[PDB]
Amino acid sequence: YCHRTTIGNFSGPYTYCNTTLDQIGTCWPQSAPGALVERPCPEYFNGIKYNTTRNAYRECLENGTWASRVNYSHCEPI
């Protein structure tokens, strides 16, 4: 998993979404205040191995944080 909350060097970008980790093995770094980020759907996290097409739309609260949206509702078990 990913940790820490900074960029390549000390003191770089402005207030952005904190580099976090959600339910799936997806690390969400500095995106943009009020910006929706997309990532591929789960590939190998369960006993099933398939469904390599859907994605995961995550929103970045304008306040400078991360949301718990994702595209699970329209994805598949995995």
Side-chain angles (χ1 to χ4, degrees), residues 32-67:
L36 214 80
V37 59
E38 20 61 273
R39 298 296 181 254
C41 256
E43 215 161 293
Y44 328 97
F45 292 116
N46 223 298
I48 77 106
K49 242 101 290 192
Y50 52 74
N51 186 74
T52 21
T53 322
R54 285 92 124 70
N55 87 318
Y57 290 107
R58 196 169 232 78
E59 130 206 78
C60 177
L61 263 303
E62 60 98 75
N63 239 233
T65 179
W66 272 125

mmCIF file of all heavy atoms in Angstrom, residues 32-67:
data_model
loop_
_atom_site.group_PDB
_atom_site.id
_atom_site.type_symbol
_atom_site.label_atom_id
_atom_site.label_comp_id
_atom_site.label_asym_id
_atom_site.label_seq_id
_atom_site.Cartn_x
_atom_site.Cartn_y
_atom_site.Cartn_z
ATOM 1 N N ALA A 32 -6.961 17.014 -8.195
ATOM 2 C CA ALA A 32 -7.360 18.401 -8.434
ATOM 3 C C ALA A 32 -8.655 18.719 -7.684
ATOM 4 O O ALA A 32 -9.616 17.950 -7.757
ATOM 5 C CB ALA A 32 -7.540 18.654 -9.928
ATOM 6 N N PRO A 33 -8.705 19.852 -6.951
ATOM 7 C CA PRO A 33 -9.906 20.247 -6.200
ATOM 8 C C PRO A 33 -11.134 20.343 -7.109
ATOM 9 O O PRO A 33 -11.245 21.257 -7.926
ATOM 10 C CB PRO A 33 -9.540 21.621 -5.614
ATOM 11 C CG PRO A 33 -8.353 22.079 -6.396
ATOM 12 C CD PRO A 33 -7.620 20.834 -6.804
ATOM 13 N N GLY A 34 -12.044 19.376 -6.969
ATOM 14 C CA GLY A 34 -13.243 19.349 -7.796
ATOM 15 C C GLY A 34 -13.007 18.641 -9.124
ATOM 16 O O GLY A 34 -13.452 19.110 -10.170
ATOM 17 N N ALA A 35 -12.293 17.514 -9.075
ATOM 18 C CA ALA A 35 -11.979 16.742 -10.268
ATOM 19 C C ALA A 35 -12.225 15.248 -10.058
ATOM 20 O O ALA A 35 -11.815 14.669 -9.046
ATOM 21 C CB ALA A 35 -10.530 16.982 -10.674
ATOM 22 N N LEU A 36 -12.890 14.637 -11.025
ATOM 23 C CA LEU A 36 -13.193 13.207 -10.981
ATOM 24 C C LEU A 36 -12.063 12.397 -11.620
ATOM 25 O O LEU A 36 -11.700 12.619 -12.777
ATOM 26 C CB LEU A 36 -14.516 12.915 -11.700
ATOM 27 C CG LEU A 36 -15.351 11.777 -11.101
ATOM 28 C CD1 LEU A 36 -16.121 12.265 -9.885
ATOM 29 C CD2 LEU A 36 -16.306 11.220 -12.140
ATOM 30 N N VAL A 37 -11.516 11.455 -10.859
ATOM 31 C CA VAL A 37 -10.434 10.600 -11.344
ATOM 32 C C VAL A 37 -10.957 9.200 -11.676
ATOM 33 O O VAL A 37 -11.849 8.678 -10.999
ATOM 34 C CB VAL A 37 -9.288 10.506 -10.314
ATOM 35 C CG1 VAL A 37 -9.793 9.951 -8.994
ATOM 36 C CG2 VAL A 37 -8.137 9.669 -10.853
ATOM 37 N N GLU A 38 -10.415 8.607 -12.733
ATOM 38 C CA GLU A 38 -10.840 7.279 -13.178
ATOM 39 C C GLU A 38 -9.703 6.255 -13.123
ATOM 40 O O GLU A 38 -8.550 6.555 -13.446
ATOM 41 C CB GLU A 38 -11.403 7.345 -14.607
ATOM 42 C CG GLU A 38 -10.985 8.581 -15.403
ATOM 43 C CD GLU A 38 -9.482 8.691 -15.595
ATOM 44 O OE1 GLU A 38 -8.809 9.261 -14.706
ATOM 45 O OE2 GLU A 38 -8.979 8.217 -16.632
ATOM 46 N N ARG A 39 -10.052 5.037 -12.722
ATOM 47 C CA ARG A 39 -9.093 3.937 -12.631
ATOM 48 C C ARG A 39 -9.762 2.623 -13.049
ATOM 49 O O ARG A 39 -10.973 2.475 -12.906
ATOM 50 C CB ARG A 39 -8.540 3.836 -11.203
ATOM 51 C CG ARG A 39 -7.782 5.080 -10.751
ATOM 52 C CD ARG A 39 -6.535 5.311 -11.590
ATOM 53 N NE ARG A 39 -5.780 6.494 -11.156
ATOM 54 C CZ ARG A 39 -5.753 7.656 -11.814
ATOM 55 N NH1 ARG A 39 -6.572 7.880 -12.830
ATOM 56 N NH2 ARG A 39 -4.932 8.614 -11.421
ATOM 57 N N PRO A 40 -8.994 1.654 -13.585
ATOM 58 C CA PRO A 40 -9.547 0.361 -14.030
ATOM 59 C C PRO A 40 -10.169 -0.454 -12.889
ATOM 60 O O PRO A 40 -9.715 -0.390 -11.744
ATOM 61 C CB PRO A 40 -8.328 -0.369 -14.612
ATOM 62 C CG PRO A 40 -7.149 0.297 -13.990
ATOM 63 C CD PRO A 40 -7.540 1.735 -13.811
ATOM 64 N N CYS A 41 -11.212 -1.221 -13.217
ATOM 65 C CA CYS A 41 -11.901 -2.052 -12.224
ATOM 66 C C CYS A 41 -10.985 -3.155 -11.680
ATOM 67 O O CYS A 41 -9.987 -3.514 -12.309
ATOM 68 C CB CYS A 41 -13.164 -2.684 -12.828
ATOM 69 S SG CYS A 41 -14.718 -1.884 -12.303
ATOM 70 N N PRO A 42 -11.327 -3.712 -10.498
ATOM 71 C CA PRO A 42 -10.547 -4.782 -9.861
ATOM 72 C C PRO A 42 -10.219 -5.923 -10.831
ATOM 73 O O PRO A 42 -11.087 -6.388 -11.570
ATOM 74 C CB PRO A 42 -11.459 -5.280 -8.724
ATOM 75 C CG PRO A 42 -12.782 -4.617 -8.942
ATOM 76 C CD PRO A 42 -12.498 -3.351 -9.688
ATOM 77 N N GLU A 43 -8.955 -6.353 -10.830
ATOM 78 C CA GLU A 43 -8.505 -7.427 -11.721
ATOM 79 C C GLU A 43 -8.303 -8.756 -10.977
ATOM 80 O O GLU A 43 -8.728 -9.806 -11.461
ATOM 81 C CB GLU A 43 -7.213 -7.016 -12.436
ATOM 82 C CG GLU A 43 -7.116 -7.546 -13.863
ATOM 83 C CD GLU A 43 -6.102 -6.804 -14.713
ATOM 84 O OE1 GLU A 43 -6.327 -5.610 -14.999
ATOM 85 O OE2 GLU A 43 -5.090 -7.424 -15.106
ATOM 86 N N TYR A 44 -7.653 -8.717 -9.809
ATOM 87 C CA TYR A 44 -7.408 -9.939 -9.032
ATOM 88 C C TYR A 44 -7.460 -9.679 -7.522
ATOM 89 O O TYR A 44 -6.420 -9.571 -6.867
ATOM 90 C CB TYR A 44 -6.045 -10.561 -9.394
ATOM 91 C CG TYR A 44 -5.623 -10.362 -10.832
ATOM 92 C CD1 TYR A 44 -4.758 -9.334 -11.185
ATOM 93 C CD2 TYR A 44 -6.087 -11.202 -11.835
ATOM 94 C CE1 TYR A 44 -4.369 -9.150 -12.497
ATOM 95 C CE2 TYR A 44 -5.702 -11.022 -13.150
ATOM 96 C CZ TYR A 44 -4.844 -9.997 -13.473
ATOM 97 O OH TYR A 44 -4.463 -9.810 -14.778
ATOM 98 N N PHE A 45 -8.668 -9.592 -6.967
ATOM 99 C CA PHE A 45 -8.832 -9.360 -5.529
ATOM 100 C C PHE A 45 -9.796 -10.373 -4.890
ATOM 101 O O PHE A 45 -10.111 -10.271 -3.703
ATOM 102 C CB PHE A 45 -9.330 -7.931 -5.273
ATOM 103 C CG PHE A 45 -8.326 -6.865 -5.612
ATOM 104 C CD1 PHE A 45 -8.585 -5.946 -6.615
ATOM 105 C CD2 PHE A 45 -7.129 -6.777 -4.922
ATOM 106 C CE1 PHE A 45 -7.668 -4.959 -6.926
ATOM 107 C CE2 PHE A 45 -6.207 -5.793 -5.228
ATOM 108 C CZ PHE A 45 -6.477 -4.883 -6.232
ATOM 109 N N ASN A 46 -10.267 -11.346 -5.678
ATOM 110 C CA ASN A 46 -11.196 -12.357 -5.180
ATOM 111 C C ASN A 46 -10.926 -13.725 -5.809
ATOM 112 O O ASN A 46 -9.961 -13.900 -6.570
ATOM 113 C CB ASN A 46 -12.637 -11.923 -5.474
ATOM 114 C CG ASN A 46 -13.566 -12.176 -4.307
ATOM 115 O OD1 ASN A 46 -13.753 -13.319 -3.892
ATOM 116 N ND2 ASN A 46 -14.153 -11.117 -3.771
ATOM 117 N N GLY A 47 -11.798 -14.691 -5.508
ATOM 118 C CA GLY A 47 -11.659 -16.028 -6.066
ATOM 119 C C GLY A 47 -12.016 -16.089 -7.547
ATOM 120 O O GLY A 47 -11.776 -17.104 -8.202
ATOM 121 N N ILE A 48 -12.575 -14.998 -8.080
ATOM 122 C CA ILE A 48 -12.949 -14.935 -9.491
ATOM 123 C C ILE A 48 -11.899 -14.158 -10.284
ATOM 124 O O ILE A 48 -11.281 -13.230 -9.759
ATOM 125 C CB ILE A 48 -14.338 -14.274 -9.687
ATOM 126 C CG1 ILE A 48 -14.249 -12.752 -9.554
ATOM 127 C CG2 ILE A 48 -15.345 -14.828 -8.693
ATOM 128 C CD1 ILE A 48 -14.352 -12.029 -10.877
ATOM 129 N N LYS A 49 -11.689 -14.541 -11.540
ATOM 130 C CA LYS A 49 -10.701 -13.872 -12.383
ATOM 131 C C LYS A 49 -11.294 -13.507 -13.746
ATOM 132 O O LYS A 49 -11.214 -14.284 -14.701
ATOM 133 C CB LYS A 49 -9.460 -14.759 -12.551
ATOM 134 C CG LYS A 49 -8.186 -14.133 -11.998
ATOM 135 C CD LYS A 49 -7.814 -14.709 -10.635
ATOM 136 C CE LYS A 49 -8.786 -14.263 -9.553
ATOM 137 N NZ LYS A 49 -8.286 -14.576 -8.184
ATOM 138 N N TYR A 50 -11.889 -12.318 -13.820
ATOM 139 C CA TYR A 50 -12.502 -11.825 -15.056
ATOM 140 C C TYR A 50 -13.030 -10.399 -14.865
ATOM 141 O O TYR A 50 -12.851 -9.807 -13.799
ATOM 142 C CB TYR A 50 -13.628 -12.766 -15.517
ATOM 143 C CG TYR A 50 -14.656 -13.084 -14.451
ATOM 144 C CD1 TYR A 50 -15.603 -12.144 -14.066
ATOM 145 C CD2 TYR A 50 -14.682 -14.330 -13.836
ATOM 146 C CE1 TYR A 50 -16.544 -12.436 -13.098
ATOM 147 C CE2 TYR A 50 -15.623 -14.628 -12.868
ATOM 148 C CZ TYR A 50 -16.550 -13.678 -12.503
ATOM 149 O OH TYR A 50 -17.485 -13.974 -11.537
ATOM 150 N N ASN A 51 -13.667 -9.850 -15.904
ATOM 151 C CA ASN A 51 -14.212 -8.490 -15.856
ATOM 152 C C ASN A 51 -13.081 -7.449 -15.888
ATOM 153 O O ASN A 51 -12.866 -6.708 -14.928
ATOM 154 C CB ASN A 51 -15.091 -8.305 -14.607
ATOM 155 C CG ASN A 51 -15.794 -6.961 -14.571
ATOM 156 O OD1 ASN A 51 -16.751 -6.722 -15.303
ATOM 157 N ND2 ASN A 51 -15.316 -6.069 -13.718
ATOM 158 N N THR A 52 -12.359 -7.408 -17.008
ATOM 159 C CA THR A 52 -11.247 -6.472 -17.186
ATOM 160 C C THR A 52 -11.619 -5.374 -18.188
ATOM 161 O O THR A 52 -10.971 -5.216 -19.223
ATOM 162 C CB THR A 52 -9.992 -7.219 -17.666
ATOM 163 O OG1 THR A 52 -10.337 -8.464 -18.255
ATOM 164 C CG2 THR A 52 -9.002 -7.499 -16.559
ATOM 165 N N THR A 53 -12.679 -4.629 -17.881
ATOM 166 C CA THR A 53 -13.143 -3.560 -18.776
ATOM 167 C C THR A 53 -13.649 -2.327 -18.020
ATOM 168 O O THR A 53 -13.294 -1.202 -18.363
ATOM 169 C CB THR A 53 -14.249 -4.082 -19.698
ATOM 170 O OG1 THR A 53 -13.978 -5.409 -20.112
ATOM 171 C CG2 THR A 53 -14.435 -3.249 -20.945
ATOM 172 N N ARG A 54 -14.492 -2.540 -17.007
ATOM 173 C CA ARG A 54 -15.053 -1.431 -16.231
ATOM 174 C C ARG A 54 -13.967 -0.642 -15.497
ATOM 175 O O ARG A 54 -12.807 -1.061 -15.425
ATOM 176 C CB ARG A 54 -16.096 -1.942 -15.237
ATOM 177 C CG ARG A 54 -17.416 -2.331 -15.890
ATOM 178 C CD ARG A 54 -17.450 -3.805 -16.267
ATOM 179 N NE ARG A 54 -18.589 -4.499 -15.657
ATOM 180 C CZ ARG A 54 -19.858 -4.309 -15.998
ATOM 181 N NH1 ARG A 54 -20.182 -3.469 -16.966
ATOM 182 N NH2 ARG A 54 -20.809 -4.962 -15.363
ATOM 183 N N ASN A 55 -14.354 0.508 -14.959
ATOM 184 C CA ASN A 55 -13.419 1.375 -14.243
ATOM 185 C C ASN A 55 -13.954 1.810 -12.865
ATOM 186 O O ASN A 55 -14.855 1.189 -12.305
ATOM 187 C CB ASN A 55 -13.083 2.596 -15.117
ATOM 188 C CG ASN A 55 -14.068 3.738 -14.955
ATOM 189 O OD1 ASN A 55 -15.277 3.529 -14.890
ATOM 190 N ND2 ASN A 55 -13.552 4.953 -14.891
ATOM 191 N N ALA A 56 -13.354 2.866 -12.318
ATOM 192 C CA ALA A 56 -13.710 3.392 -11.005
ATOM 193 C C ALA A 56 -13.569 4.919 -10.961
ATOM 194 O O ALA A 56 -12.456 5.442 -10.874
ATOM 195 C CB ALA A 56 -12.818 2.731 -9.969
ATOM 196 N N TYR A 57 -14.698 5.634 -11.030
ATOM 197 C CA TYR A 57 -14.674 7.101 -10.999
ATOM 198 C C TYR A 57 -14.669 7.624 -9.563
ATOM 199 O O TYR A 57 -15.643 7.459 -8.824
ATOM 200 C CB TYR A 57 -15.874 7.697 -11.747
ATOM 201 C CG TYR A 57 -15.833 7.514 -13.248
ATOM 202 C CD1 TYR A 57 -16.670 6.604 -13.879
ATOM 203 C CD2 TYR A 57 -14.964 8.262 -14.034
ATOM 204 C CE1 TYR A 57 -16.642 6.442 -15.252
ATOM 205 C CE2 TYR A 57 -14.933 8.104 -15.407
ATOM 206 C CZ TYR A 57 -15.772 7.195 -16.009
ATOM 207 O OH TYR A 57 -15.739 7.035 -17.373
ATOM 208 N N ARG A 58 -13.575 8.271 -9.180
ATOM 209 C CA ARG A 58 -13.452 8.836 -7.840
ATOM 210 C C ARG A 58 -13.410 10.361 -7.903
ATOM 211 O O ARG A 58 -12.691 10.941 -8.717
ATOM 212 C CB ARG A 58 -12.205 8.291 -7.144
ATOM 213 C CG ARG A 58 -12.208 8.513 -5.641
ATOM 214 C CD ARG A 58 -11.100 7.729 -4.960
ATOM 215 N NE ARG A 58 -11.612 6.919 -3.854
ATOM 216 C CZ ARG A 58 -12.258 5.765 -4.003
ATOM 217 N NH1 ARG A 58 -12.439 5.246 -5.201
ATOM 218 N NH2 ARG A 58 -12.727 5.132 -2.947
ATOM 219 N N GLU A 59 -14.191 11.007 -7.045
ATOM 220 C CA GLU A 59 -14.254 12.460 -7.012
ATOM 221 C C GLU A 59 -13.284 13.033 -5.979
ATOM 222 O O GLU A 59 -12.999 12.409 -4.952
ATOM 223 C CB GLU A 59 -15.700 12.898 -6.730
ATOM 224 C CG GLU A 59 -15.874 13.918 -5.607
ATOM 225 C CD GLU A 59 -17.247 13.831 -4.966
ATOM 226 O OE1 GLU A 59 -17.466 12.909 -4.155
ATOM 227 O OE2 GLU A 59 -18.120 14.660 -5.294
ATOM 228 N N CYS A 60 -12.783 14.228 -6.263
ATOM 229 C CA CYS A 60 -11.850 14.908 -5.367
ATOM 230 C C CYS A 60 -12.481 16.181 -4.820
ATOM 231 O O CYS A 60 -12.482 17.220 -5.486
ATOM 232 C CB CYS A 60 -10.539 15.233 -6.084
ATOM 233 S SG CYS A 60 -9.354 16.170 -5.066
ATOM 234 N N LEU A 61 -13.028 16.085 -3.611
ATOM 235 C CA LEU A 61 -13.686 17.217 -2.955
ATOM 236 C C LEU A 61 -12.884 18.509 -3.100
ATOM 237 O O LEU A 61 -11.690 18.553 -2.788
ATOM 238 C CB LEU A 61 -13.923 16.902 -1.476
ATOM 239 C CG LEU A 61 -15.326 16.393 -1.137
ATOM 240 C CD1 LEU A 61 -16.382 17.398 -1.573
ATOM 241 C CD2 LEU A 61 -15.579 15.046 -1.791
ATOM 242 N N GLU A 62 -13.561 19.561 -3.568
ATOM 243 C CA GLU A 62 -12.944 20.877 -3.760
ATOM 244 C C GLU A 62 -12.167 21.331 -2.518
ATOM 245 O O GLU A 62 -11.218 22.106 -2.625
ATOM 246 C CB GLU A 62 -14.016 21.918 -4.114
ATOM 247 C CG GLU A 62 -15.098 22.081 -3.051
ATOM 248 C CD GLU A 62 -14.849 23.258 -2.126
ATOM 249 O OE1 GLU A 62 -15.063 24.407 -2.559
ATOM 250 O OE2 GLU A 62 -14.442 23.025 -0.967
ATOM 251 N N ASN A 63 -12.568 20.834 -1.344
ATOM 252 C CA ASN A 63 -11.900 21.184 -0.089
ATOM 253 C C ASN A 63 -10.449 20.683 -0.067
ATOM 254 O O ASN A 63 -9.641 21.145 0.740
ATOM 255 C CB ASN A 63 -12.678 20.610 1.101
ATOM 256 C CG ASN A 63 -13.131 21.677 2.082
ATOM 257 O OD1 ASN A 63 -12.862 21.584 3.277
ATOM 258 N ND2 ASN A 63 -13.830 22.689 1.591
ATOM 259 N N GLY A 64 -10.122 19.741 -0.960
ATOM 260 C CA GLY A 64 -8.772 19.205 -1.024
ATOM 261 C C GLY A 64 -8.664 17.812 -0.436
ATOM 262 O O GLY A 64 -7.704 17.506 0.270
ATOM 263 N N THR A 65 -9.648 16.964 -0.724
ATOM 264 C CA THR A 65 -9.649 15.590 -0.214
ATOM 265 C C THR A 65 -10.120 14.591 -1.268
ATOM 266 O O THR A 65 -10.179 14.897 -2.461
ATOM 267 C CB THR A 65 -10.505 15.481 1.058
ATOM 268 O OG1 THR A 65 -10.535 14.144 1.535
ATOM 269 C CG2 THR A 65 -11.938 15.936 0.873
ATOM 270 N N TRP A 66 -10.433 13.393 -0.807
ATOM 271 C CA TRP A 66 -10.885 12.309 -1.679
ATOM 272 C C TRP A 66 -12.305 11.855 -1.348
ATOM 273 O O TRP A 66 -12.753 11.962 -0.207
ATOM 274 C CB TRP A 66 -9.933 11.124 -1.548
ATOM 275 C CG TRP A 66 -8.784 11.190 -2.494
ATOM 276 C CD1 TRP A 66 -7.461 11.134 -2.176
ATOM 277 C CD2 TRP A 66 -8.855 11.332 -3.911
ATOM 278 N NE1 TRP A 66 -6.702 11.222 -3.312
ATOM 279 C CE2 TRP A 66 -7.536 11.344 -4.394
ATOM 280 C CE3 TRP A 66 -9.908 11.445 -4.822
ATOM 281 C CZ2 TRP A 66 -7.243 11.462 -5.746
ATOM 282 C CZ3 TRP A 66 -9.616 11.565 -6.164
ATOM 283 C CH2 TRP A 66 -8.292 11.571 -6.614
ATOM 284 N N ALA A 67 -13.003 11.330 -2.357
ATOM 285 C CA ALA A 67 -14.363 10.842 -2.176
ATOM 286 C C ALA A 67 -14.420 9.313 -2.215
ATOM 287 O O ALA A 67 -13.450 8.651 -2.593
ATOM 288 C CB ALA A 67 -15.268 11.430 -3.245
#
